[PDB]
Give the backbone structure.
Amino acid sequence: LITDTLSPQAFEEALRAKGDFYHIHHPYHIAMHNGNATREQIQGWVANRFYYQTTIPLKDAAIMANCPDAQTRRKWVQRILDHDGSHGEDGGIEAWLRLGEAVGLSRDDLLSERHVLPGVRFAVDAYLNFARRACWQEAACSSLTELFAPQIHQSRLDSWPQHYPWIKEEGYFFFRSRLSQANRDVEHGLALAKAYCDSAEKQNRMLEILQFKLDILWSMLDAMTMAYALQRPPYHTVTDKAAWHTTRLVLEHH
Amino acid sequence: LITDTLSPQAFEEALRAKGDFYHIHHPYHIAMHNGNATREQIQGWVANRFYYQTTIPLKDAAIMANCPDAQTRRKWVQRILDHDGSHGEDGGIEAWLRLGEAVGLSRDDLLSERHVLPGVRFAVDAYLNFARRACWQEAACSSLTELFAPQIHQSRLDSWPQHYPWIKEEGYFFFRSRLSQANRDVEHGLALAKAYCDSAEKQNRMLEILQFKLDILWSMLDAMTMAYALQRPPYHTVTDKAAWHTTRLVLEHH
Ligand SMILES: O=C(O)c1cc(C(=O)O)c2c(n1)C(=O)C(=O)c1cc(C(=O)O)[nH]c1-2
Ligand SMILES: O=C(O)c1cc(C(=O)O)c2c(n1)C(=O)C(=O)c1cc(C(=O)O)[nH]c1-2
Ligand SMILES: [Cl-]
Ligand SMILES: [Cl-]
């Protein structure tokens, strides 16, 4: 715990130290990196991570709605454009659908969101609800797990082709695009964090907010582990079919 | 799937059939019932389920905030009284703390909420968030897993004394109190559902809301299983200490 307020430069390094808990250290990721994941595990990861990807623009729009500073909104909106496309070009959500196709899943497999597990849904929804309710500065700075993302994207680019040569080349476009996007994103996030977190109280709170974000990522992979590695998906004692709910209940009627 | 609107009696039958997916069928519950859970597994369950218990009055207050009908509010507030108590350590939250003491945990172990796993937190927070955002009728009716609760309370009253004689008597007061309270609650909840859900569209929607509620309960137990049965609590690959966030971030500073 911080007792005497860190300088902006020392505070940046305390945020970066949270990378010790990044999801690159989760066994599910480690198995994929080492070549020990199954195709079913890879497909399940791609289908479930699509729910996070399609939530990113929702959460960034939520931050914008709570942010009365036009300067900050002019920069932040680029995140929405990167994922949704500008306009019919493509964008990150389309690139994720192409990763789906590269691992053998149809566009409808991903777009239906029928394979998204409830533990993934509750973790990703927690991110959106924080973004809706927290002050904009706190919600914007919870993006800063992006500090650690280029390293994980590059790890996949380096390892997957050797172990999983059946994954089509087009599939890798998203990970390569993020090497530059995540870097520009954090150039903004860090400036915000270092300006805003100017007391020991705000610095400790922000570190706890970043821990919450890391917990979301870890918990998504825990749900995937139960379902696809341990043959304990929801209701496995009662049925062999998927029985969980499949609807963003507060955003869509059915 | 319902095509032609069910009668109120047939709709009740449809709600009751969802009991097939109730958490009495989860392996973590089954192990406790059969006498095969460890003292640590039982203590972890009591500490984590306290986060659900302390959220119930928050959720019920959220329902009331969204309910412009005074008649309904006059009935619903009794749920808040039941958990918070009319006076003194009276109430269900205090009874759960006494269950904590009966299994060997202090009041601070529970009140600090330091043992609450992120997967339990995100599932339970999903409940609260639905109650804050959905229409009051739908949020109220998501209580209807109470249809199945007296049986699970009775299962513990029947099995635990013999398997776990070290659990102190006073521990069993909460489960016994809920045999009557859950029945009083569902009298109202089922009357509301049968009156409100008077079209095929509303009936289909409500069965999906009840499934969402079932999925929350199942996912809480999946998180406990990872941490306490499978030796895979968060961050186990990089630390032996608890490193998850421990704060209701949007409701308390820290
Ligand atoms: O593949 C990954 O492991 C990973 C992790 C994260 C993260 O650290 O939050 C993001 C992404 N990918 C990603 O593709 C993405 O567009 C993204 C946006 C954000 C954010 O919080 O706004 N995180 C991440
Ligand atoms: O011990 C159990 O398995 C169990 C289950 C549930 C449930 O079915 O939602 C409740 C409770 N307990 C409980 O003690 C309680 O006070 C309660 C209120 C509610 C509700 O949704 O408002 N559910 C439950
Ligand atoms: Cl990224
Ligand atoms: Cl109950």
